[PDB]
From Swiss-Prot, chains A, B, C:
Subcellular location field: Cytoplasm; Cytoplasmic granule
Name used for this protein in its record: Arginase-1
Gene: Arg1
UniProt-annotated binding residues for substrate: H121, T122, D123, I124, N125, S132, G133, N134, D178, T241, E272
Cofactor: Mn(2+)
UniProt region (Disordered), positions on chain: 1-22
Activity control summary: Inactivated by diethyl pyrocarbonate (DEPC).
Family: Belongs to the arginase family.
Post-translational modification Phosphothreonine, affected residues: T276
Induction / repression: By arginine or homoarginine.
Annotated cofactor note: Binds 2 manganese ions per subunit.
GO cellular component labels: cytoplasm; cytosol; extracellular space; mitochondrial outer membrane; neuronal cell body
Impact reported for D227C: Reduced manganese binding and strongly reduced catalytic activity
Length: 314, 314, 314
């Protein structure tokens, strides 16, 4: 199956900028080139051009509503289009807000998808529960069917229609959840593996169960949304909300490695890589590089080594 | 149950000072404030005033006997008093020597308690086996019943009466044990989980077994003595005896998270945080902060998130 | 059984030097002294004197053929000699090329030995598959019977005779394998435990299976070839090819600890410690020290503590 890289240089989902430079940093680290060398066809769609909506008045507490909604609508169109053509979409964020566009668009072509959310956060706050109107913490609230009508309509999101139910999303790496968000995941009965579960079961058992839970009765498309802050700050320091005690570089690669095994990866999001937040040039280099590794792992690169079939090396 | 923070700014249990500043650093990092925000009532008893015993002649090899004995006696009184009033005591050390006072005072009210000792060391040297008279390495030797009369009487400890048996203490994180101490833990048949066992079983199984061993037949009060050096020096660098290959920040939090689960925590010691040993300001900040996290974890803070009951967030 | 330390200050197996200083650094860190304090007799054979072969023309792509061959031949003689006298050989490299000499010499006396290869690389490239003639990446290619005659004769290795079969070597910590090398280990059906397997099973299960696979039917001599780059660069930074996501200090000691348990250790190689590659003096100190720890672990030092038998400490 061919791959379609799509850049989403957007940051209105959070206060300070920097995230819009994410895709540039990743491309500059030779993401696309390195991708080409695998058993997958690669096409770089380029970066979407986002327009700043004038006089974007804060909807109550929610900030930059119309811009984020506009951007997400434009993305969902592009995503759905490539998906329609039978390609796997790889979105380079950008902040978590863009996960609305990515998942939606993906759903229009594959309504039976499942989402595996690797993040240190749940990002399931609604316009009513947000302690800050920052939309990077609400993407999942806009997608859940069970949350339809549980919060007022936000200017710019009229086009969005809840495309997934609680029984279709699995969180991995949770370690910074708000009281409201915890009430939500508990009440709705969502399957999650926070750091304590990973500690208790080991990354192996976690993946073993997320799969039997999601791909139990019927094998369906997997949409992996990967927030770089799911790994410990010692690995991915250049992000907006780093939290200590995260997943290790090894754990991060084991996850993507098992995702490739299933052969059901349909959509991938590499979000939150903010190049201006790195304390030193090395910190940024470390962050960008680890993101690249995670992506390559998703598409065949294994740590035991690779090699072309039918070719004799001896 | 209410909480009673007690400061033990003592350091005579080891050569160089710095440890007496531990409680100041912890309070200064907002320990008490952060504690207040949980489902527990918090009362800060302040710092005990320790008097330096004049002409404290070294008892053979043991150094500062009368001072440490005096201090520990005073502490045990205070601990026992608060315990008597039905509160959970949280002692802020101070060096490991203060563990005598804390556990004793705790025992007077709850003689059926069990001690879980998270440390990189056993600290079970007796006056006869100590390679240095430093009392921070002998606390457990003064509490064990099976060691009663195995060593001469030390000036200042006449008030002490062995309160626990080998069958009531579990060590976690051992990785720097003296030949003598190893002979003692082996001969006495004490249950311990050194680093190799943690590697072999995983922190999960470790906790699972410490519990069935201790809380097997009857559920009793748990006294947690936590030496900051139980975690790797990359996490808690500001301490007297850091040893490489220790418990991770995640393993450290998993332990305390399981302790809270039992709902049997009755006494807690946060020892050995030495602010002057940090190579850089950041190193100290890291050490103090991780201690705070461990304490909050003991009292309800979970990594999956929290939230008040009866409150509707939607 | 007595121990015989043998120094192999050689570096012609790779481009830049530094590796020849490894044995000096290790001795200087008190390796031999610390060894003496265990339940093993220690004899330091000193460092072999290697002669530089004049006009060593590059055999096609392979560089420094006659020198490495000469060096390895001389080493094999010394190894075999001490082995012959019933002693355990401990070689201090030096780059991985010297693994040919060590293993061969060892086999002449114990032809039924098994090789446990802890490394981040397979080092199984043949003169035909090497992307660089550097011989530190080909040691295992010269020892495998299944690769006999699969590549031309290299000047200087006429004395070598394949001494092990694919069913006798187990790799641990693989994470930087060339396509050719992966074709080779796959086609030949070699047992390996790359980082993904370590992540999936835990170091415990890894050792549990390497043993039943190797020491299944008959207990035979174990030859442990330990490349310092098998551990994460945060532990052993001074080496030629560090790779992120390696084994931890704990995992490294757990392995050596289980090796001692079997009581079948017959030969040990501590390779690749390059003192000039350390970014700071501390980085070198860290590297050197961790190697020393690994060695001591192999010979009885346990993290739970040790103590002499028949001696009463109470
Ligand atoms: Mn996040
Ligand atoms: Mn300690
Ligand atoms: Mn290597």
């Amino acid at each position: 199956k061919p791959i379609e890289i799509i850049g989403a240089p957007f940051s209105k989902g959070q206060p300070r900028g920097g995230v819009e430079k994410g895709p540039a940093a990743l491309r500059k680290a030779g993401l696309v080139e390195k991708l080409k060398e695998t058993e997958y066809n690669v096409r770089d769609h380029g970066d979407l051009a986002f327009v700043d909506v004038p006089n974007d008045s804060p909807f109550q507490i929610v900030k930059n509503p119309r811009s984020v909604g506009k951007a997400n609508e434009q993305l969902a169109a592009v995503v759905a289009e490539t998906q329609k053509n039978g390609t796997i979409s790889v979105v380079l964020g950008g902040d978590n807000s863009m996960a609305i566009g990515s998942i939606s668009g993906h759903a229009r072509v594959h309504p039976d998808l499942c989402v595996i959310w690797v993040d240190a956060h749940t990002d399931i706050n609604t316009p009513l529960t947000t302690s800050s109107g920052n939309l990077h913490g609400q993407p999942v609230a806009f997608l859940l069917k069970e949350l339809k009508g549980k919060f007022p309509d936000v200017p710019g999101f009229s086009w969005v229609t809840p495309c997934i139910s609680a029984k279709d999303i699995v969180y991995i790496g949770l370690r910074d959840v708000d009281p409201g968000e915890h009430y939500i995941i508990k009440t709705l009965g969502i399957k999650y593996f926070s750091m304590t579960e990973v500690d208790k079961l080991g990354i192996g058992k976690v993946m073993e169960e997320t799969f039997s839970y999601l791909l139990g009765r019927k094998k369906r498309p997997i949409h992996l949304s990967f927030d770089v802050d799911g790994l410990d700050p010692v690995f991915t320091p250049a992000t907006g909300t780093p939290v200590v005690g995260g997943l290790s570089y090894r754990e991060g690669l084991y996850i993507t490695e098992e995702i490739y095994k299933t052969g059901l990866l349909s959509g991938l999001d590499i979000m939150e890589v903010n190049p201006t937040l790195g304390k030193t040039p090395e910190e940024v280099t470390r962050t960008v590089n680890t993101a690249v590794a995670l992506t390559l792992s998703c598409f065949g690169t294994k740590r035991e080594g690779n090699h072309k079939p039918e070719t004799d090396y001896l």
